[PDB]
Design a protein around this ligand. Sequence first.
Ligand SMILES: C[C@H](CCC(=O)O)[C@H]1CC[C@H]2[C@@H]3CC[C@@H]4C[C@@H](CC(C)(C)O)CC[C@]4(C)[C@H]3CC[C@]12C
Lengths: 10, 231
Amino acid sequence: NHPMLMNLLK
Amino acid sequence: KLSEEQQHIIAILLDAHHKTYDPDFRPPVPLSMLPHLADLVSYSIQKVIGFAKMIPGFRDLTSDDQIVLLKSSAIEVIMLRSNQSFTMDDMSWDCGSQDYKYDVTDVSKAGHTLELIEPLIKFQVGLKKLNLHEEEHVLLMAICIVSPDRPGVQDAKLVEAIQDRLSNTLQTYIRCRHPPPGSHQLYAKMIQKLADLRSLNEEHSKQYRSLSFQPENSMKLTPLVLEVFGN
Ligand SMILES: C[C@H](CCC(=O)O)[C@H]1CC[C@H]2[C@@H]3CC[C@@H]4C[C@@H](CC(C)(C)O)CC[C@]4(C)[C@H]3CC[C@]12C
């Protein structure tokens, strides 16, 4: 539900 | 007495801050400033995430707990970190030049009312008056992000253990390094500032919900802002 946040956290 | 561990935590948070805060966007122009300031906030979210990832112990949370902590804190950290560019000389954020100088008029033209802006400006004045060390500023940003009372947190005990190590590091720093009488109840005044940020967060969300149910306004936002602040 939060792919951009998830990507930035990686 | 500041342990080796406590000094290591401070060093790490200072460098994380230096790497991610520096006073590409749509140009500054009642909503004329929303494109420019939505870009600025969008960029600032990326930097907040950068800072969070470097908080000792943040990495040990599940991806789900990292997401809820950043979703709930991002706007508070942006308001808090903005205190370093804020000047009481003219109640403005002076990111270098008149182009990227933002007064009450500027930030009042992004679809938010004085019901957010006035408390926001009074919060910056209050925070300047505390005259925090940068060491205290970065611990307060880290404590703001890693708080076990945010909605949706799964492992509250691990978040609390991380926040307690940061809190103990801050209280110890204040006692060892903050000059009395400036140190008197400084921890309590800092936690009160975090409460002011939760209140600012609440007002922001209420105004965000209203604004972003106007699709013409949502259109001026960024994908990251819509994902973090919601749809
Ligand atoms: C300029 C300053 C940072 C300087 C720095 O970092 O050194 C930042 C920090 C806090 C920022 C405000 C936060 C609330 C909203 C958020 C979006 C609006 C949406 C629609 C996303 O809520 C844009 C308008 C407004 C008012 C911001 C204006 C710009 C502010 C004041």
